[PDB]
Amino acid sequence: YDKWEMERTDITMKHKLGGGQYGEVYEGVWKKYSLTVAVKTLEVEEFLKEAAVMKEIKHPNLVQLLGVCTREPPFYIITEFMTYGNLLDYLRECNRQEVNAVVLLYMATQISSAMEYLEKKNFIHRDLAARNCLVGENHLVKVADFGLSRLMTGDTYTAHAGAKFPIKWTAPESLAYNKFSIKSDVWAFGVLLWEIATYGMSPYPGIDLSQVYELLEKDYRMERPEGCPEKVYELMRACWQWNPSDRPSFAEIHQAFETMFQES
Amino acid sequence: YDKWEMERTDITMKHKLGGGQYGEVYEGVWKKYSLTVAVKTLKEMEVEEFLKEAAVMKEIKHPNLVQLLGVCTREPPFYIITEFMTYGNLLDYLRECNRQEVNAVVLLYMATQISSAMEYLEKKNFIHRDLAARNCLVGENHLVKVADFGLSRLMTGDTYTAHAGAKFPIKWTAPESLAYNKFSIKSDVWAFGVLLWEIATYGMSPYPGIDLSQVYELLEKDYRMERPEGCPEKVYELMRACWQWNPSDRPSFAEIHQAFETMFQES
Numbered sequence: 001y002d003k004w005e006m007e008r009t010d011i012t013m014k015h016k017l018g019g020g021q022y023g024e025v026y027e028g029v030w031k032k033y034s035l036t037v038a039v040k041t042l043e044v045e046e047f048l049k050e051a052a053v054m055k056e057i058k059h060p061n062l063v064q065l066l067g068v069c070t071r072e073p074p075f076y077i078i079t080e081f082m083t084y085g086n087l088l089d090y091l092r093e094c095n096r097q098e099v100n101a102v103v104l105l106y107m108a109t110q111i112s113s114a115m116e117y118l119e120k121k122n123f124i125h126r127d128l129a130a131r132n133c134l135v136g137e138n139h140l141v142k143v144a145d146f147g148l149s150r151l152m153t154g155d156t157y158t159a160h161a162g163a164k165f166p167i168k169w170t171a172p173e174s175l176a177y178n179k180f181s182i183k184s185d186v187w188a189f190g191v192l193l194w195e196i197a198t199y200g201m202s203p204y205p206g207i208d209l210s211q212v213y214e215l216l217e218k219d220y221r222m223e224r225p226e227g228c229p230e231k232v233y234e235l236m237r238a239c240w241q242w243n244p245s246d247r248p249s250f251a252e253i254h255q256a257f258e259t260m261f262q263e264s
Numbered sequence: 265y266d267k268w269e270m271e272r273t274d275i276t277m278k279h280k281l282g283g284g285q286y287g288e289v290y291e292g293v294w295k296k297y298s299l300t301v302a303v304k305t306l307k308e309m310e311v312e313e314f315l316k317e318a319a320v321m322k323e324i325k326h327p328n329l330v331q332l333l334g335v336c337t338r339e340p341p342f343y344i345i346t347e348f349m350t351y352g353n354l355l356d357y358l359r360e361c362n363r364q365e366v367n368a369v370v371l372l373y374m375a376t377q378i379s380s381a382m383e384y385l386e387k388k389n390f391i392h393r394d395l396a397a398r399n400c401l402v403g404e405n406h407l408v409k410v411a412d413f414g415l416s417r418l419m420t421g422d423t424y425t426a427h428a429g430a431k432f433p434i435k436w437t438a439p440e441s442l443a444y445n446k447f448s449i450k451s452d453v454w455a456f457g458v459l460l461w462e463i464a465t466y467g468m469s470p471y472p473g474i475d476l477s478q479v480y481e482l483l484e485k486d487y488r489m490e491r492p493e494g495c496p497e498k499v500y501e502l503m504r505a506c507w508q509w510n511p512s513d514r515p516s517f518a519e520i521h522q523a524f525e526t527m528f529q530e531s
């Protein structure tokens with residue numbers, strides 16, 4: 001924890017990144033290494049808890065923590081900077097000849113690797129979506145990891161009373177009972193697969209949010225996107241099983257995508 | 265897992281190979297067979313891409329492509345184990361050889377072997393994308409094999425578009441690749457032409473003294489490297505054919521290999 005502490009003065013703050021969609025997150029420069037970094041600034045105990053979790057996280061496809069300023073306010077969380085920004089904008093703007101089917105498989109394989117790691121370490125993500133995935137050089141993809149929750153005892157994590165979720169990415173049991181688990185992360189992953197497959201289209205386009213839960217209850221599911229391989233869509237549908245115990249594990253998901261990626 | 269998986273303990277590592285120019289590649293011993301092998305390991309290339317390269321190598325079977333022997337992919341550190349080519353890379357080999365031994369007939373033999381490998385990749389819908397003397401390896405009696413880590417699956421005749429910001433070895437790179445990041449078996453043919461030039465000059469650097477930033481401009485105006493000293497006109501014609509501006513005007517590797525086999529046999 002102390003090894004993570006840095007002086008705030010080591011960093012030159014720049015502009016807020018991502019058009020402000022992530023709140024107080026700024027592009028910054030670590031002067032010593034001339035290294036571009038991402039800096040989130042400051043809710044205190046939650047903030048410190050999240051920094052503490054990020055200290056324990058070590059995976060090639062999870063955003064890597066570089067430093068922390070938790071001695072005095074303003075508080076800082078310093079992480080690596082992903083040059084190509086968030087996956088949603090990236091998909092929307094890319095050359096699809098370059099970012100073709102094999103690359104889409106590659107992205108899914110990387111993300112599922114990160115989630116398999118979290119699954120094993122008894123963490124849950126709770127905000128898996130393309131907007132929260134980042135892209136680096138050579139189609140490298142990493143998942144943003146501020147907000148991970150640790151499962152202290154059971155498989156299920158209960159969100160704070162009155163918490164609001166992104167409805168279109170949120171599993172039915174999470175919508176209904178504010179219960180989250182690695183299986184609700186698997187549901188969100190299914191939606192993320194749909195985002196990838198459509199090069200960043202909005203899920204359930206044109207559908208009333210008030211109807212989403214009931215539609216899901218009565219077995220409505222997004223149709224296979226144009227050009228999406230049938231095996232990928234099968235995985236998508238598996239992720240969207242109504243009963244969480246019927247959804248595949250991230251280990252299974254990652255194995256399947258790894259196989260498809262390697263055969264491509 | 266499959267027949268390819270082996271225990272890490274089957275292998276004893278020695279020193280890093282090739283002066284480190286190929287990264288984390290080591291000479292090693294497969295203890296069971298007292299066999300010297302080459303081992304590529306992963307310290308920190310993305311993992312999934314590494315594993316995919318191993319997967320592709322499992323499918324490769326040709327006398328002039330480096331043969332995969334085994335793989336360690338259960339747990340880190342990951343290994344790709346292949347046969348070891350005693351004389352190292354073709355570039356240094358050509359530079360350091362006794363040219364009375366590595367004479368004209370041997371140069372033809374080398375081109376024939378390499379073109380055989382590329383004809384095989386062409387048939388099997390793979391592209392190499394980094395053909396050059398530095399990526400060919402030499403064994404006893406002038407045996408040559410093409411290094412095949414990095415192969416990509418691509419239906420022969422289709423185009424692969426490289427990632428934005430990718431940096432290429434400019435002097436080996438086809439004009440459509442330089443300009444538009446487009447690669448195909450035909451860009452491999454272009455690079456093969458440059459490799460032929462490397463062979464004919466015994467490992468000279470191509471486009472000597474020419475500013476890299478101008479190479480593309482020159483190629484546009486139909487500048488091409490001159491015939492190397494001692495290079496037979498037929499071989500130079502093949503070279504020039506490999507460097508046609510339009511990829512579809514370049515010969516196939518089947519055609520190239522047939523031409524070299526004929527020349528080697530007529531020697």
Ligand SMILES: COc1ccc(OS(=O)(=O)F)cc1-c1c[nH]c2ncc(-c3cncc(C(=O)N(C)C)c3)cc12
Nearest residue numbers: 017018022038040077079080081082083085086144146
């Ligand atoms: C979703 O990305 C993040 C969300 C929260 C966050 O706070 S944390 O430090 O406590 F984790 C950090 C990030 C984040 C870590 N590294 C990052 N690298 C790049 C970006 C980013 C996302 N979207 C757009 C931009 C951008 O404006 N450019 C690339 C120009 C940049 C965003 C991040």
Ligand SMILES: COc1ccc(OS(=O)(=O)F)cc1-c1c[nH]c2ncc(-c3cncc(C(=O)N(C)C)c3)cc12
Nearest residue numbers: 281282286302304344346347348349350352353411413
């Ligand atoms: C281009 O050579 C390789 C590159 C990558 C690689 O990884 S892997 O996934 O395909 F295994 C393996 C090789 C490789 C396979 N067999 C080989 N045999 C010899 C050499 C080599 C190249 N250059 C110099 C040396 C050397 O230092 N000596 C022979 C002393 C040895 C290099 C190799």
